[PDB]
Amino acid sequence: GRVRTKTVKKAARVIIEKYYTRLGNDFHTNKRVCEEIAIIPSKKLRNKIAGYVTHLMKRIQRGPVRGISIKLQEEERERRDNYVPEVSALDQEIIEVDPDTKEMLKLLDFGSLSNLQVTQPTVGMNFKTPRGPV
Amino acid sequence: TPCGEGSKTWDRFQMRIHKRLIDLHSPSEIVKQITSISIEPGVEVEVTIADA
Amino acid sequence: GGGHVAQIYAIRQSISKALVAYYQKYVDEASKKEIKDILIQYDRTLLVADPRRCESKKFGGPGARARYQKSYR
Amino acid sequence: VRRACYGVLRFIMESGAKGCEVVVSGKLRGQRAKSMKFVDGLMIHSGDPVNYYVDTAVRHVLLRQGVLGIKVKIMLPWDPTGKIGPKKPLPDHVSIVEPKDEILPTTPISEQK
Amino acid sequence: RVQPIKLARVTKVLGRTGSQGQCTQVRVEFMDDTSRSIIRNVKGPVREGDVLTLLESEREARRL
RNA sequence: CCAACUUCUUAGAGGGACAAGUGGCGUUCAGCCACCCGAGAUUGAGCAAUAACAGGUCUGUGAUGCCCUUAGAUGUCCGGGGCUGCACGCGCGCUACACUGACUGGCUCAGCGUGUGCCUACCCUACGCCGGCAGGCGCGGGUAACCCGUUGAACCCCAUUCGUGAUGGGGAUCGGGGAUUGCAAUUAUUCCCCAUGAACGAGGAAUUCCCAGUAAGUGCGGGUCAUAAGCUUGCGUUGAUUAAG
RNA sequence: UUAAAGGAAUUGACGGAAGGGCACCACCAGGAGUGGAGCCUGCGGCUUAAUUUGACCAACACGGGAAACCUCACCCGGCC
Ligand SMILES: [Mg+2]
Ligand SMILES: [Mg+2]
C-alpha cells in the first residue's frame, strides 16, 4: 500500500535532475527546499514527493543511477576520455600467430617484414561441442 | 431515488453555517462607515440595537 | 463526559501524568525519568491517550460494519 | 443533431477550453431512443476538482416527437487566475521552476557597497 | 505401543496448506538433536521458532 | 477596573507522517517485513471511467410523444366504505424462553441534534399548585454555545426479595374503567390503571451479516408527526471470543 | 426440396480447460444470529361492491407507502 504513483516519481526525478546541489540526505530540509522551489498543490503530496527525493539521495550517492545531473555525469568524462595508457595494449612488439595465418600474410609480402614468433595449434580437432541433451 | 427500486442508498446533504461575534464601545453614527466598506454577498451582518 | 468506565480510565491517566508534568517543572527530570521508568514498562496507556473513537454508522445496517439480512427467495 | 453538435463542440474548444463533451439523448432518427456523445479534450470525472473545473448544464428540447436531452460540460482552464478560470491548480501535477544559469561561483572577489 | 510424547521445536514454516489456508507445515526438530528433523503439519497460528507437542511422532506430511 | 489566564470548551490559521530512521529480504530495482521515536506507521467516508441493461420510475414534476376519456365526464368536490378483510405460504424485524436473571430500593456517567410556521392552524419546555397514573390549570423562558439543559439516558454499579416450577421467567390474548389529539376514535389512534396470564425450555434441512472501539448488548435524537415507531437514519455508552505489394 | 451449406482467420461471451491473482455481498477459525414460538409490518393466495396499484443478487419496514377523514387511484351515492 506504500507504492508511489507516477506523478510523485516523475516530479521527484525532475527535482534531483535540476536542484541536486541544493539537496541532501535529510528529509526535513528537502521538504523545505521543494516547498520553496516547486509549486505543490497540497501538503500531502509535498512531503510524499520529498520522501522519494531523499530516497534518491542515498540511491545516487552510491552510484550512477539514471542520473543526468552534472557532477555524476562530468565524472564519467574522466573515464571515457581519461585512462589513455602510457604504454599500449597493442604495442608489445612480441605477439603470437599460427602457421596458417602466417601463410595468409605470406602472400601479403609481410612474411619477413614482421617479427611474429609463432605458436602451434594443439592438434586434436576437439571443437563442435557434443550433441543431444546429455 | 425517484421511486422504490434500487439498493437502499442514501445521500447525505449538509450545510455548515458559521457565526462570529464582536463587541464595540463605538458611537452609533460611525457604525455605518464601518458597515459600508464591504459588498461581500455571502455574509449576513447585523448590528445590535443601541439601548444595550 | 464519557461513561462510568471511560471516566475512571481518564482520571487514572490524569493523576498519573499530572505529577509528571509537575515534576518536569518544579523538580528535575532525573526524578521524572525515574518514575516514568515505572509508568511505561507497566501498561504504557497511563500517560498516552487512546486514539480510537466512535467510527460512524452507514446506511445499510444497524451499525457501522454489519448489514441488514439479505434475502433471495 | 450531428450538424448542431459539431458547431457547438468546435466553439467551446476554440474559446480556450481544456476539454468538453456533449451528450444528446432521445428519440433520434428511428423509433428506439439512443444517445450520441461527442467527447473531446481531457476531462476529469472524480474528486472534488470536478465541481469548479467543470460546469454542467442539462436541458430539454421538446420536439414534435418525444423530448431530447442535452447535457453539456466544459472543463475550465487554470491559467487566467481571474475571470474565466479557477484559481487553486489541479492537485495531481507539479510546476517546478527552472533555475538560473549560475554565473560567478568561482575564485573570490570583494567589493564595498 | 506407547510412544514417548515428544515435544518438538519448529524451524522455518513452509507456507499454508490444506485447501482452505487452515493448516501450515513446520518441519519440527525433535528436542534431542536438531540433526534429526521431520516435516509435519499443524493448525492454528504458529509463530516461527516456538515449541509444539507431538502425541504421535512420525507418520507423514502433506504429500501425495 | 471592587483579577489575571486559556489547561479543559469553542473554532481559525499553521504544523505533523513521508515507509522518513535502524536491521533483515529482494535483480540490493520497485518494494516487503520487523523495531525505534511518535498522538498516529492502513480512521471512516464522499465523489468515481468506457460501453451498456428493452433494470425501475408516465403514481414525484406546468419534463413529455402518441393513444383513451372530456359534462350521466377517467376533471373536481362531498358523505360513507375499503386499501387493516383470513383454512394457508414466504420475507425484513420486535420480545422472549430466565439465577451471567427477574423484581424492589439505592447510587451514578452521554454524544449527535431539534425547537413559535409567508400560505400554516399546530414549537421545545422550566417552575408552582391540583391527581395514584395518564394528564389538567397557573406563571415564565427560548428564533437558541443565552431557555428547556451542567441534556441527572439506559445498560451497568451497590443492597433486597425470589429460588429450577412454564416460577415472581415470558406478556400474547381479553373484560371493565380513566384521560389526551381530532370535525369524527366503532374495525379497539395513542396513553394510563386493575384484572385475565397463551405458546415459548434455545430452535431440523437451510441461510445471513461481520475482523476492532469491530460484532453484540444498551438507551438517545432526526425523519414520518394534529395523534403517534416494533421502521429507517444518526448518535453516544459497555465492549469482546476468532498496407508501400 | 432449399438460400444457403461450407473454409480460414478476428473480437467477444462461455467451458464440470489450464496457469497467475483477489473479495467475510466467498470460504476457513469463530461470533451474533435468522429459520422453531408469540406479536409487528410488507408480498402471494383466498374472500370481497372494493379489498387501488407499482416492483418478483439488482421485488417483499420498498415506492421515504406509520391510510382513522384528507392523502385516494378503488367501491356505493350526490353535487359542481
Ligand atoms: Mg412520474
Ligand atoms: Mg435459573
Task: Give the distance (Å) from ligand 1 centre to CA of residue B1.
Answer: 12
Judging by beta carbons within 10 Å of its beta carbon (0-12, 13-18, 19+), is residue D69 exposed, middle or buried?
Answer: middle
For chain E, the distance separating the N- and C-terminal CA atoms, rounded to the nearest angstrom, is 27
The C-alpha cell of E37 is what? 528433523
Residue type, A117: Q
A114: left (phi over 0), alpha (psi -120 to 50) or beta: beta
Residue D90: other Cβ atoms inside 10 A: 15
The sign of the CA dihedral D26, D28, D33, D36 is negative
Q: What is the 3-state secondary structure (H, E, C) of A48-69?
A: HHHHHHHHHHHHHCCCCCCCCC
Residues 6+ apart with CB under 8 A from A73: A67
- Which residues on adjacent β-strands are paired with residue D95? A39
Measured CA to CA, the distance from residue D8 to residue D22 in angstroms comes to 9
Measured CA to CA, the distance from residue D22 to residue D16 in angstroms comes to 16
Residue with CA nearest to G34's C1' atom: C69
Distance from CA of C59 to the nearest CA of B (A): 6
State the chains in contact with A (3 or more Cβ–Cβ pairs under 8 Å): D
The C-alpha cell of B52 is what? 444595550
Measured CA to CA, the distance from residue D69 to residue D59 in angstroms comes to 6
Q: Among the residues of chain E, which ranges form H helices?
A: none
Q: Among the residues of A19-118, which ranges form H helices?
A: 27-37, 44-60, 70-74, 77-80, 101-104
Task: Give the distance (Å) from ligand 1 centre to CA of residue D51.
Answer: 29
Q: Please provide residue A10's backbone torsions phi and psi, each rounded to the nearest 5 degrees.
A: -75, -25
| Chain D residues within 8 Å of chain A (Cβ atoms) | 88-99
Residue D23: other Cβ atoms inside 10 A: 16
Q: Please provide residue A111's backbone torsions phi and psi, each rounded to the nearest 5 degrees.
A: -75, -45
Nearest CA to A17 out of A4, A3, A34 is that of A34
E6 within 8 A of E52, measured Cβ to Cβ: no
Task: Decide if B36 touches C, using CB distance below 8 A.
Answer: no
DSSP letters, E15-26, are -EETTTT-EEE-
Nearest CA to E14 out of E50, E55, E53, E62 is that of E62
The C-alpha cell of A99 is what? 602457421
Measured CA to CA, the distance from residue E20 to residue A78 in angstroms comes to 61
Residue type, E60: E
Q: Please provide residue A31's backbone torsions phi and psi, each rounded to the nearest 5 degrees.
A: -55, -40
Q: How many CB pairs under 8 A join A and D?
A: 35
Task: Give the distance (Å) from ligand 1 centre to CA of residue D63.
Answer: 20
Q: Tell me which residue has cell 453614527.
A: B29
The C-alpha cell of A9 is what? 516519481
E29 within 8 A of E9, measured Cβ to Cβ: yes
Judging by beta carbons within 10 Å of its beta carbon (0-12, 13-18, 19+), is residue D25 exposed, middle or buried?
Answer: middle
User: What's the angle, vertex CA D41, arms to CA D39 and CA D47, rounded to 5?
Assistant: 90
For chain C, the C-alpha Rg in angstroms (whole number) is 21
Residue type, D112: Q
Domain ranges of chain E: 1-64
C-chain residues near B8 (CB < 8 A) = 59-60
Measured CA to CA, the distance from residue A62 to residue A59 in angstroms comes to 6
Residues 6+ apart with CB under 8 A from D57: D70, D71, D72, D73
Q: What is the DSSP letter of A73?
A: H
A72 within 8 A of A32, measured Cβ to Cβ: no
Judging by beta carbons within 10 Å of its beta carbon (0-12, 13-18, 19+), is residue B31 exposed, middle or buried?
Answer: middle
For residue A82, CA distances in Å to A67, A69, A78 come to 21, 20, 5
Measured CA to CA, the distance from residue E31 to residue E50 in angstroms comes to 11
